[PDB]
Design a protein around this motif. Structure first.
Motif, PDB file in Angstrom:
ATOM      1  N   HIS A  16      29.106  31.562  12.497  1.00  0.00           N
ATOM      2  CA  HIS A  16      29.293  32.233  11.424  1.00  0.00           C
ATOM      3  C   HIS A  16      30.898  32.675  10.906  1.00  0.00           C
ATOM      4  CE1 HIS A  16      28.725  35.153   8.043  1.00  0.00           C
ATOM      5  NE2 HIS A  16      29.349  36.150   8.885  1.00  0.00           N
ATOM      6  N   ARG A  17      31.379  33.053  12.014  1.00  0.00           N
ATOM      7  CA  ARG A  17      33.077  33.407  11.914  1.00  0.00           C
ATOM      8  C   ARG A  17      33.777  32.112  11.702  1.00  0.00           C
ATOM      9  NH1 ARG A  17      36.281  37.418  12.954  1.00  0.00           N
ATOM     10  NH2 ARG A  17      35.377  39.303  13.483  1.00  0.00           N
ATOM     11  N   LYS A  18      33.292  30.995  12.105  1.00  0.00           N
ATOM     12  CA  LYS A  18      33.943  29.846  11.570  1.00  0.00           C
ATOM     13  C   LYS A  18      33.850  29.597  10.189  1.00  0.00           C
ATOM     14  CE  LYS A  18      34.807  25.364  13.854  1.00  0.00           C
ATOM     15  NZ  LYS A  18      34.216  24.123  13.613  1.00  0.00           N
ATOM     16  N   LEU A  19      32.582  29.561   9.660  1.00  0.00           N
ATOM     17  CA  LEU A  19      32.504  29.600   8.185  1.00  0.00           C
ATOM     18  C   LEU A  19      33.206  30.533   7.493  1.00  0.00           C
ATOM     19  CD1 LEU A  19      30.847  28.468   5.842  1.00  0.00           C
ATOM     20  CD2 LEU A  19      28.844  29.921   6.444  1.00  0.00           C
ATOM     21  N   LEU A  20      33.242  31.849   7.793  1.00  0.00           N
ATOM     22  CA  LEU A  20      33.781  32.775   7.006  1.00  0.00           C
ATOM     23  C   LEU A  20      35.488  32.453   6.934  1.00  0.00           C
ATOM     24  CD1 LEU A  20      33.098  36.617   7.599  1.00  0.00           C
ATOM     25  CD2 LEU A  20      32.455  34.995   5.794  1.00  0.00           C
ATOM     26  N   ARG A  22      36.740  29.442   7.246  1.00  0.00           N
ATOM     27  CA  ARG A  22      36.946  28.239   6.391  1.00  0.00           C
ATOM     28  C   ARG A  22      36.976  28.680   4.972  1.00  0.00           C
ATOM     29  NH1 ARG A  22      32.710  25.993   9.068  1.00  0.00           N
ATOM     30  NH2 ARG A  22      31.861  25.479   7.101  1.00  0.00           N
ATOM     31  N   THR A  23      36.289  29.729   4.443  1.00  0.00           N
ATOM     32  CA  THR A  23      36.216  29.985   2.957  1.00  0.00           C
ATOM     33  C   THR A  23      36.722  31.318   2.538  1.00  0.00           C
ATOM     34  OG1 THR A  23      34.090  31.032   3.048  1.00  0.00           O
ATOM     35  CG2 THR A  23      33.933  28.599   3.307  1.00  0.00           C
ATOM     36  N   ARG A  24      37.940  31.623   3.223  1.00  0.00           N
ATOM     37  CA  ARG A  24      38.518  33.027   3.003  1.00  0.00           C
ATOM     38  C   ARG A  24      38.947  32.865   1.502  1.00  0.00           C
ATOM     39  NH1 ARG A  24      40.442  35.804   6.825  1.00  0.00           N
ATOM     40  NH2 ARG A  24      41.969  34.469   7.780  1.00  0.00           N
ATOM     41  N   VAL A  25      39.805  31.994   0.954  1.00  0.00           N
ATOM     42  CA  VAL A  25      40.558  32.008  -0.125  1.00  0.00           C
ATOM     43  C   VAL A  25      39.512  31.819  -1.250  1.00  0.00           C
ATOM     44  CG1 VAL A  25      42.197  30.934  -1.531  1.00  0.00           C
ATOM     45  CG2 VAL A  25      42.693  31.317   0.837  1.00  0.00           C
ATOM     46  N   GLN A  26      38.345  30.962  -1.203  1.00  0.00           N
ATOM     47  CA  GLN A  26      37.511  30.655  -1.910  1.00  0.00           C
ATOM     48  C   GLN A  26      36.457  31.840  -2.159  1.00  0.00           C
ATOM     49  OE1 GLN A  26      33.649  29.007  -1.509  1.00  0.00           O
ATOM     50  NE2 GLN A  26      33.476  29.266  -3.534  1.00  0.00           N
ATOM     51  N   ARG A  27      36.090  32.594  -1.368  1.00  0.00           N
ATOM     52  CA  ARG A  27      35.453  33.946  -1.460  1.00  0.00           C
ATOM     53  C   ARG A  27      36.420  35.029  -1.944  1.00  0.00           C
ATOM     54  NH1 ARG A  27      35.053  36.535   3.232  1.00  0.00           N
ATOM     55  NH2 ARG A  27      35.840  34.622   4.367  1.00  0.00           N
ATOM     56  N   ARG A  28      37.763  35.236  -1.706  1.00  0.00           N
ATOM     57  CA  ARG A  28      38.639  35.947  -2.318  1.00  0.00           C
ATOM     58  C   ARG A  28      38.646  35.946  -3.796  1.00  0.00           C
ATOM     59  NH1 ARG A  28      43.315  36.540   1.514  1.00  0.00           N
ATOM     60  NH2 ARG A  28      42.899  37.776   3.251  1.00  0.00           N
ATOM     61  N   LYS A  29      38.829  34.451  -4.059  1.00  0.00           N
ATOM     62  CA  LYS A  29      39.062  34.282  -5.821  1.00  0.00           C
ATOM     63  C   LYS A  29      37.677  34.470  -6.443  1.00  0.00           C
ATOM     64  CE  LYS A  29      38.533  29.357  -5.975  1.00  0.00           C
ATOM     65  NZ  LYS A  29      39.077  27.881  -5.563  1.00  0.00           N
ATOM     66  N   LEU A  30      36.349  34.108  -5.660  1.00  0.00           N
ATOM     67  CA  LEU A  30      35.089  34.309  -6.356  1.00  0.00           C
ATOM     68  C   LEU A  30      34.998  35.951  -6.513  1.00  0.00           C
ATOM     69  CD1 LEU A  30      32.924  35.120  -4.315  1.00  0.00           C
ATOM     70  CD2 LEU A  30      33.025  32.575  -4.032  1.00  0.00           C
ATOM     71  N   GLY A  31      35.446  36.653  -5.683  1.00  0.00           N
ATOM     72  CA  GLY A  31      34.963  38.085  -5.829  1.00  0.00           C
ATOM     73  C   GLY A  31      36.331  39.165  -5.882  1.00  0.00           C
TER      74      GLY A  31
END
Lengths: 31, 131, 122, 48
Positions: A16-20, A22-31
Motif C-alpha cells: 500500500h505504501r508503494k502504491l501511495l 507511485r501516485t502522489r502527484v496524480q492524487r494531489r492533482k485530482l484532489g
RNA sequence: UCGAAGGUGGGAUCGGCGAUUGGGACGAAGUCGUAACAAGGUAGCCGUACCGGAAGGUGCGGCUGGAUCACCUCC
RNA sequence: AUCAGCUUGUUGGUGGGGUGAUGGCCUACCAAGGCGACGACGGGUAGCCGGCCUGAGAGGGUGACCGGCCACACUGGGACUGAGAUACGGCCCAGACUCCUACGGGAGGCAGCAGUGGGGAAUAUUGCACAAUGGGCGCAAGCCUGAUGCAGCGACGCCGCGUGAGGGAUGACGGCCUUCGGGUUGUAAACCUCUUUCAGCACAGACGAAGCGCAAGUGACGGUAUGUGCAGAAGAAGGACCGGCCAACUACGUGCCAGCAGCCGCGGUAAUACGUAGGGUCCGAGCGUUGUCCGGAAUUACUGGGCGUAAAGAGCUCGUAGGUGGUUUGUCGCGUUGUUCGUGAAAACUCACAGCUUAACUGUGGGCGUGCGGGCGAUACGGGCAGACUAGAGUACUGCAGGGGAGACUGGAAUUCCUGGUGUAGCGGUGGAAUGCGCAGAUAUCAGGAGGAACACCGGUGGCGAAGGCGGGUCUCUGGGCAGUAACUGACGCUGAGGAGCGAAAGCGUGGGGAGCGAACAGGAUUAGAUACCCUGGUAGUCCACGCCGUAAACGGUGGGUACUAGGUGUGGGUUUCCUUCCUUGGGAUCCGUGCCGUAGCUAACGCAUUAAGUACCCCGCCUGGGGAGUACGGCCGCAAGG
RNA sequence: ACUAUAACCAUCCUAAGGUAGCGAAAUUCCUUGUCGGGUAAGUUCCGACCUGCACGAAUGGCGUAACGACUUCUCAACUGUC
RNA sequence: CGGCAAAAUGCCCCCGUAACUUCGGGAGAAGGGGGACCCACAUGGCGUGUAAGCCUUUACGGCCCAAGCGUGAGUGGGUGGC
C-alpha cells in the motif's frame, strides 16, 4: 504468536505504501 | 475503593474456608452481624461474636469443620450487588441447591431465609446464596 | 462487559448474509438462456460440467447448473431456475429445474424421477 | 434489570413568577395553557 | 389575503454509463529471482525515511515472539 | 453521526379573532426565547395491536385468516350539507389517462362482489338466497341489503376413513443373489371362507324456524346430510432414501468419463457414494425439492462469553457528563414489598366439562391477561432529608532517598583537522584483496592550536518518573514519593464516555552548527547476476533554538481502585524491641518498593501464583471466522509525509 | 503454457548514459495521430493514450488560490454582424 | 479569421450567493424583490436650539428646553400612466 501474521500484514502495508508513493502527484492533482 | 461490604464479607468467609482457617475477623456493621446471625442459626458457621477494634468494632466468626476436616460451607454467592440489584416477590423466591441451600432475603420484617419469607408471604432484596 | 456498559451500548447481533439474492424472495424464477456451454470444475475433481447463463426476471444475470444426464438447452430457451449450490463450480448458486417450461426431464430415468422431472412409465 | 435514572423537562405556569432557578417547586397537571405548557405551579417547597 | 398546479433559478442528495486507469481474489504445468521458517546461511520483527525489476536493501530508535556459548585447570 | 447543530409563529405574554372545546389554532404588539449527544435536525424502512411461529425459558422473527384502532378511495387542493364527512359507488377546480362530439362542448374512476388484460414461481365462479343473523326506510304489511348465510373451483392446510379380514406351505411360478448346496421376495401369491366401511344403485328423508305472516303458507343450502335395503373383494398407492451424520446392501453397466454431492467427499474395468435392477428402510394420499423465520448457536452470552500467548487493555495521565460509594442516629415511604379495589374487549393459549359417529372444529366455566391507576400496611435494603464519627481521602509537622524536570556556567579523556619539529617508504583495509591515501614527504612520534559531539571507571537486573524516559561537575528554579507523630477537615472517595495535555525514533519548517557516525549517492570486491551483505569515500540527518507530527514489539503483548488467600530467600528507602561487643547485613518486629523459588487456587497448555493470570465488588476500553482491509468513499486533522 | 509484447539476459561504446515529473505540448515532421466529450455537421477546444522527428528538473520541472485592455474554446442574454 | 462594431447590463435599499482557496478571498459571484404622487400615523422620531426653568467654582459658564427651522426611514390607505 507466529510471525506469519505479522509478515502478511507487513506485506500488505508495504504494498500500500508503494502504491501511495507511485501516485502522489496524480492524487494531489485530482484532489 | 470499597464498594460492597457484604460481598467483601462473603469473600473473606470463602477465602478463610478454602484455607481451612478456624477464624476470620472483619470490621463490624449491623447488616454483617445480622447475616452472621442467619448463618449461625442455619448451621453454616460455628459461632460468632463482636469484639471492639482500635477505631470501631470487629466481627469474629468461627468456621465449622467436620471431624474429618470437611467444610460446612460449599459455596457463597452474592446475588444483589451495587449497580444491578435483585428483588423478588413472595411468590418467585429463589431456590438454592434445589432447596438444599439457603437464600438470604432482606424483607421489611428483617433478614429472613427463602423458606421463612415464603412461609410469611413477603418479598425483598435477595442478598446472597449459601449452600 | 459491565451492566452499565450494556445499558449504554447494548448488544448488536451479527448481520445475516443474504443467499441467492437473484431470486428476490421467490422460491423460483423464470429466465432465458443467454448462453449454454460447459466448464471444468475445481482441481481435485475433473469433469465437463454443463452450465447455462440465465437472465432472470429479476434483471440479474446468473450462471446456473443443469442437473441430470442429457439436456436439450440452446439459446433463447425459457427455463425455471431454483436455488442450490454446486461445490465444484466456484460461483454457481442456482440449478435449472428439470421438467419445467422448455427444459425437459431426463431420459430413461427410473429412480429419483421426481427430482429430474421424469414421468412414471405407463 | 438495572435501575435507570432519566430526566425530563416540563413547562409550568406561575402567575407572579415567585420561583427562581434552583428551587424545589411542586406542580400539578392542567389543561393546555399554550403549546407545550401543561403544568401549574402549586408552591415552592424549598428555595435555593 | 391565503391558495394546488405551472414557470424561472441556484444549489443539496442518491444512483447508472464513461475513453482511460489503480489495486484485489483465484488459476497443476510459463518467466525472473531466494525474501521468510533450522543462527534459513546478513537473527527476525515494529515505527519511520530513502532507494531498488521484484521479493527486498540500508540508516535511526525499539522488542525477543532470537540460535550457540565447547574446554574452563585453585578451592 | 460516514446525519451536530435545529428553530423565527419559533418559544412565552397581553388584547382581539376563531372553535363544540383548550390551545401560535389565527392575528397585532411585546419579550428572546425553545430543542439537542438522555441523539435534536436529517436519511432509510414501516400501517399499530390482540395475536401467530420458534424457544426449556429469557429472547428472536412476524402482523396471513379472525378481532380492534388508524389511514386512504385515479393524482393534488377545497369546501358544502348534515347530529356526524379521508364523503369508495356526492360536489368544485387543476392534472394525467380513456371515451362521445355536428368541434361549440361533454362523460368516466373495481383498493365493493364476480370478471378481464398485464406483472408474476403463484392464488378461485362474470353461482344461489334474503330461509337465519345484522342494517336502512315504513304504524304496519313490506321493500332494499355481492353485509351475510351457502354453494363452485385448488391435496393449499389440519383432521378422519378406505383401498379388505381370517385361514393358507418342508413355502408354487417368475425375479434376484449364489460358495451351484441353496437363500430371498414370501403368508406374500394361488386357493377356501367372511365382511362390506367408502364409492355405485334403490327407497325414505331432516334439524337449522318457541322464527316470520294474520295469512293459510314460508329453507338458499337440498332432495343434500342422514337412515334402510342390493350386489360383489368387488372401483381404489405412490414418493423419497439406503458411505457416515442417519432406519435401511447386493449384482450388473461405466471407468478421473458420464455423473453425484448438505458437509466430509465419491467416478483409475472387480463403485454398499454415479446409472439401472433385486432387496430393504421411512413416510403414506401423499412424498420430495426450493424459498423464508426460529432452534441447534453459550455464535452479541440479562438468564448465559470473553481480552498474557488463540480476535480482543486506548502509548500514558488529568478531568467533564454519567455510573458507583465507609460507620452510625432520626425521619420520608420515591424504589422495594404485602393486601385490596378498577382495568387489562372478545377471540386466541391453558385446565375442566359438553356437542358434533371420533378427531379436527365448536360452545360453556375457570385460569391467564406477566402491566397500569387508587386506597391501606411494612421499613431490612437502595435513595432523599437532617445530623454524628474517623478506619478511606486529604492537610500540618519532623525526617529521608533519588540519572524526576528546566536554565545557566563549566571539566577531562579520545576522534578529526590546521601549524611546526624528527623521520622515512609505505600506510589503510579484508575470509582474501582492490578502490583509497603517500612519496609534492604520508603512516608513526612530539609540541601547539580550533571545533563539535558523547560523558569511561562509579554503574547492577540498582534508583527515580504516569508513560515516553532520565546518570561529567557546579549553581539557580521546580515536581512527586516514603517513614514517623498523629495536630487538623470530616466521606471531601473511585472510575471516567466524549475532551485536554504529555508522548522514543524517524520526518517537516525557519535560523544556527557540523568532529565522529552516516540513509541516498559514488567507486572496489564477492557473485551466474549483485540496485545487498564486506571495503574506501560520502550528502541529508544525527547536535542547538523555536515550532509542527502524533505514530512504535509506545510490551509485563497483563486498564484503574479496593479487600482477602501457605511460606522460603535476595535487594532498595525508613522507623523501632532484644543479643550487645553495642563496632556488626547481630537478630527480631513493622511500613513502603523491587526480583527469584514455590502452596492452595486458576489455566487448553505454557504458565501465573500476596507485585495473580486466585477469590470478589465498582467504573472504563475492546473482541465476535480468515482474506479483501485498517483498504476504498465521505469527513476531520496536518506545511507535507501522513494520522 | 496461442499470439503478442518483454519483468529478464548478452554484447559494443562513453565522463555519464535522462531520475522525479510531464508529454500530438507556445515543443509532434509524418498529422486533420488514435480513442472519448462537446456540435446536425468540430483541421480549432477539453480528457486520455505514448510511437518524445526534436520534454525534463534554478538557460529550473510539475502544479497552484488571486490577478490580466494577454492567447484559446463553449454557453446564456443582446442585438442591422447577417 | 475572429461577436470587430453595435446592442445589452448599469443606481439605491433589502433578500440571497457555487466550486476552489494561500482562509484574506472568489463576491457586486450568480439569482430575485421594492422604488412615482397624495393622505394618515405624525404637533410623531432625529438634529439644532431661543424664550422658560434648573445649577455653579458666576462667566466669552454648564444642563435642559416649549417655539421656530431642517430632516430621514417605515407602516396603512388611496391616486395616475404603456
Amino acid at each position: 504468536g507466529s510471525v506469519i501474521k505479522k509478515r502478511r500484514k507487513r506485506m500488505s502495508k508495504k504494498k500500500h505504501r508503494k502504491l501511495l508513493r507511485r501516485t502522489r502527484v496524480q492524487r494531489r492533482k485530482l484532489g | 475503593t470499597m464498594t460492597d461490604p457484604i460481598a467483601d464479607f462473603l469473600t473473606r468467609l470463602r477465602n478463610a474456608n478454602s484455607a481451612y482457617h478456624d477464624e476470620v475477623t472483619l470490621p463490624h456493621s449491623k447488616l454483617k452481624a445480622n447475616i452472621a446471625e442467619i448463618l449461625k442459626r442455619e448451621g453454616y458457621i460455628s459461632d460468632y461474636r463482636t469484639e471492639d477494634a482500635r477505631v470501631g468494632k470487629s466481627l469474629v466468626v468461627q468456621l465449622k469443620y467436620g471431624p474429618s476436616r470437611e467444610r460446612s460451607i460449599a459455596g457463597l454467592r452474592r446475588v444483589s450487588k451495587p449497580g444491578l440489584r435483585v428483588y423478588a416477590k413472595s411468590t418467585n423466591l429463589p431456590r438454592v441447591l434445589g432447596g438444599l441451600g439457603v437464600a438470604i432475603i432482606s424483607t421489611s420484617s428483617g433478614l429472613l431465609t427463602d423458606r421463612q419469607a415464603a412461609r410469611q408471604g413477603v418479598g425483598g432484596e435477595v442478598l446472597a446464596y449459601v449452600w | 462487559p459491565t451492566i452499565q456498559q450494556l445499558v449504554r451500548k447494548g448488544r448488536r447481533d451479527k448481520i445475516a448474509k443474504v443467499k441467492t439474492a437473484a431470486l428476490k424472495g421467490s422460491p423460483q424464477r423464470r429466465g432465458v438462456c443467454t448462453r449454454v456451454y460447459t466448464t471444468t470444475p475445481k482441481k481435485p475433481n475433473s469433469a465437463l460440467r454443463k452450465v447455462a447463463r440465465v437472465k432472470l426476471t429479476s434483471q440479474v444475470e446468473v450462471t446456473a447448473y443443469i442437473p441430470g444426464e442429457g439436456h436439450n438447452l440452446q439459446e433463447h430457451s425459457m427455463v425455471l431456475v431454483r436455488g442450490g449450490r454446486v461445490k465444484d463450480l466456484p460461483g454457481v448458486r442456482y440449478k435449472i429445474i428439470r421438467g419445467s417450461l422448455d427444459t425437459q426431464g431426463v431420459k430413461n430415468r427410473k429412480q429419483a424421477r421426481s427430482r429430474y422431472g421424469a414421468k412414471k412409465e405407463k | 434489570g438495572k435501575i435507570i435514572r432519566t430526566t425530563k423537562k416540563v413547562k409550568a405556569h406561575d402567575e407572579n413568577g415567585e420561583a427562581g432557578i434552583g428551587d424545589r417547586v411542586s406542580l400539578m397537571e392542567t389543561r393546555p395553557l399554550s403549546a407545550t405548557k401543561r403544568w401549574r405551579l402549586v408552591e415552592i417547597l424549598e428555595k435555593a
